[PDB]
Amino acid sequence: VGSLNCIVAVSQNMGIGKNGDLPWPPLRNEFRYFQRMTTTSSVEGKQNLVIMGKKTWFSIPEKNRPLKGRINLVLSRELKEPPQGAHFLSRSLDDALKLTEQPELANKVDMVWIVGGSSVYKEAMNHPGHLKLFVTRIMQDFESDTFFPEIDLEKYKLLPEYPGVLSDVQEEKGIKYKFEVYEKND
Numbered sequence: 572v573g574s575l576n577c578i579v580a581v582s583q584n585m586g587i588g589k590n591g592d593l594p595w596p597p598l599r600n601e602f603r604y605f606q607r608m609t610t611t612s613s614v615e616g617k618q619n620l621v622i623m624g625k626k627t628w629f630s631i632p633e634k635n636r637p638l639k640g641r642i643n644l645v646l647s648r649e650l651k652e653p654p655q656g657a658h659f660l661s662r663s664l665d666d667a668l669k670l671t672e673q674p675e676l677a678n679k680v681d682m683v684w685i686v687g688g689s690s691v692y693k694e695a696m697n698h699p700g701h702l703k704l705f706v707t708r709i710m711q712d713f714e715s716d717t718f719f720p721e722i723d724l725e726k727y728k729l730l731p732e733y734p735g736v737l738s739d740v741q742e743e744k745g746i747k748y749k750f751e752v753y754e755k756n757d
């Protein structure tokens with residue numbers, strides 16, 4: 572148990588997913604940022620924990636499952652075991668978050684990252700303590716069927732910069748995006 576973080580990429584219309592995939596074409600540098608933010612731990616020997624819902628797990632290409640170099644945990648109210656390739660399954664975010672503090676995971680885990688999708692985000696962002704939201708603002712509209720909740724600029728602060736995050740507008744494949752980090756500490 573290190574810090575609690577959500578990471579998402581979201582279109583100008585708040586879209587995160589379309590038919591079990593992302594709503595925009597592949598953005599390699601965006602995937603690379605995701606990978607470097609979720610995989611990097613400054614503590615040797617540790618890994619970060621990625622928590623996700625079941626549709627989010629299945630949205631990941633099989634070659635990238637489980638997400639390499641991270642401990643993967645899937646949320647589901649139904650599955651009897653973790654899905655093929657996964658090793659953790661929790662019935663709730665509280666259950667998962669509790670599971671981190673021991674019996675055996677808590678000397679292996681550094682940062683905890685919520686990587687989607689909508690319901691998991693809603694609950695984490697609401698979760699009382701110290702929270703950071705890493706949001707890639709995909710600076711146009713895309714047809715979507717899954718959405719990210721509006722961020723309350725009265726509870727969260729927008730940070731002007733953040734270590735290892737590029738602060739200028741980026742562009743790729745003709746699509747502009749901004750990496751943002753928001754922080755709350757209620």
Ligand SMILES: NC(=O)C1=CN([C@@H]2O[C@H](COP(=O)(O)OP(=O)(O)OC[C@H]3O[C@@H](n4cnc5c(N)ncnc54)[C@H](OP(=O)(O)O)[C@@H]3O)[C@@H](O)[C@H]2O)C=CC1
Pocket residue numbers: 578579580581586587588589590591592593623624625626627628630646647648649650661662663664686687688689690691694717
């Ligand atoms: N742009 C981005 O940053 C991201 C995009 N996506 C996209 O979003 C979509 C998938 O997201 P979404 O449809 O929201 O689905 P989720 O990944 O949130 O999966 C929903 C399911 O997972 C379980 N689940 C979710 N929350 C909990 C919980 N708190 N406790 C127990 N189980 C839970 C369920 O399974 P059960 O029915 O078995 O209980 C529920 O049906 C895809 O299109 C994917 O590509 C996903 C992540 C990031």
Ligand SMILES: COc1ccccc1/C(C)=C\c1coc2nc(N)nc(N)c12
Pocket residue numbers: 578579580592593601602605623627628630631632635685686687706707
């Ligand atoms: C199809 O989805 C994926 C495909 C490959 C690897 C990971 C993901 C997942 C689960 C999620 C993400 C893929 O790119 C992302 N960018 C940001 N900024 N946040 C995220 N949560 C993801």
